[PDB]
Amino acid sequence: MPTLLRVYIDGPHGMGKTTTTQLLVALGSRDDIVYVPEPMTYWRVLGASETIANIYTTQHRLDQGEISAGDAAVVMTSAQITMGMPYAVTDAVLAPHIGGEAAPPPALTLIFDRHPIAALLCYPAARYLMGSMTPQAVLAFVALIPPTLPGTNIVLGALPEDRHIDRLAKRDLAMLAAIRRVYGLLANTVRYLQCGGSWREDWGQLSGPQSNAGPRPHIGDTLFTLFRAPELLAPNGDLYNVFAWALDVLAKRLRSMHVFILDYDQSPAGCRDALLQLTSGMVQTHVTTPGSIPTICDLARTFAREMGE
């Protein structure tokens, strides 16, 4: 079978993900690489009206005291469903085309602006840290994360907080801190799981980044530490089983991902070349049918045309 390379560019907004991605795509002949872009049209028009604006307005109103936490939570939960929809459908229709992990060049490279976990895990977790989502809803989103397809390469981003702030300022610091922390925790969680970490065994070590390499992180430095919330704990002090099962699901979904960290602290071309070097260690898969490749290409471009800026 022909092989496919799927790369999800993810991590906090405002680091240079989109520019870097576009530059990499530009290196290729038109047909050997396809970009599945940020579905901004869905978010602004098709799925609802101006979802990004509604999200930031709601946080501000919460921080202002103009609305309750309960009010903010219903809006954020509802908005995240809208945010995530294009990711989730794309995954669902891609799935039957993806074979086992397969190296000679891929017939097709597919590059995504974000993975489903952005909308179903990372942004909800950060909203939770900001007090505008309940941890129960975060775990409900976790339970709905689709089964992790073979060859799921995710690229996260590193950038000094000062440079990140400036970059964002030139073009909500608590939210920026929150999302940066969540993605750092994510990277550690994947490493923890691939080093054989069992959250149930280490749960009691709780009380108070990089994948790809390094030693096993402490559970206190992974996403698992976020869910010690009193909302989730029974009178005896343990997690209710329903929430423990969501953490089992979190573990299963993350542990088979291939995570890479891109240093965005350089020029656009430098980021591009760094991303290119990173793809040399990424996992390809076979496809299901010979016609899978043109189908995937059509799917991505259709997506791009309809939901892209």
Ligand X SMILES: Cc1c(C=C(CO)CO)n(C)c(=O)[nH]c1=O
Would you name the residues annotated as active-site residues?
Answer: 38
Tell me: is residue 65 an annotated ligand-binding position: no
Tell me: is residue 128 an annotated ligand-binding position: no
Measured distance between the N- and C-terminal CA atoms of the chain, rounded to whole angstroms = 34
Taking alpha carbons only, the member of 72, 66, 81, 67 closest to residue 133 is: 72
Q: Which two tokens stand for residue 99?
A: 């074979």
Tell me: is residue 60 an annotated ligand-binding position: no
- Does position 7 interact with ligand X (CB under 6 A)? The reply is no
Count of residues for the chain?
A: 309
Of 21, 77, 152, 222, the one binding a copy of itself by CB under 8 A? 77
Of 16, 38, 106, 184, the one binding ligand X by CB under 6 A? 38
| DSSP structure class, residue 232 | G
| DSSP structure class, residue 106 | -
CA 246 – CA 237 distance, rounded (Å)? 17
Burial 71-91 (b: 16+ CB within 10 A, else e): ebbebbbebbbbbbbbbbebb
| Nearer residue to a copy of itself within complex by CB, 283 or 304 | 304
Taking alpha carbons only, the member of 156, 152, 157 closest to residue 5 is: 152
CA 113 – CA 108 distance, rounded (Å)? 17
Contact 42, 114 (CB under 8 A): no
Of 119, 139, 156, 187, the one binding ligand X by CB under 6 A? 119
Please choose which of a copy of itself, ligand X, none residue 13 contacts, taking the beta carbon within 5 to 8 angstroms, the exact cut-off set by kind. Answer: ligand X
Which among 92-100, 112-120, 135-143, 166-174 is the span making contact with ligand X, rule CB under 6 A? 112-120
Q: Which two tokens stand for residue 118?
A: 């952005």
- Does position 10 interact with ligand X (CB under 6 A)? The reply is no
| Nearer residue to ligand X within complex by CB, 223 or 239 | 223
Footprint of a copy of itself on 209-248 (CB under 8 A): 240-242, 245-246, 248
- Does position 20 interact with ligand X (CB under 6 A)? The reply is no
Q: Which two tokens stand for residue 43?
A: 């978010």
Annotated binding site for ATP: 11-18, 167
Contact positions toward a copy of itself, by CB under 8 A?
39, 42, 46-48, 73-75, 77-78, 81-82, 84-86, 88-90, 92-93, 95-96, 134, 136-137, 139-141, 143-144, 146-147, 240-242, 245-246, 248-249, 252, 299, 302-303, 306-307
Contact positions toward ligand X, by CB under 6 A?
13, 38, 52, 55, 80, 83-84, 114, 118-119, 123
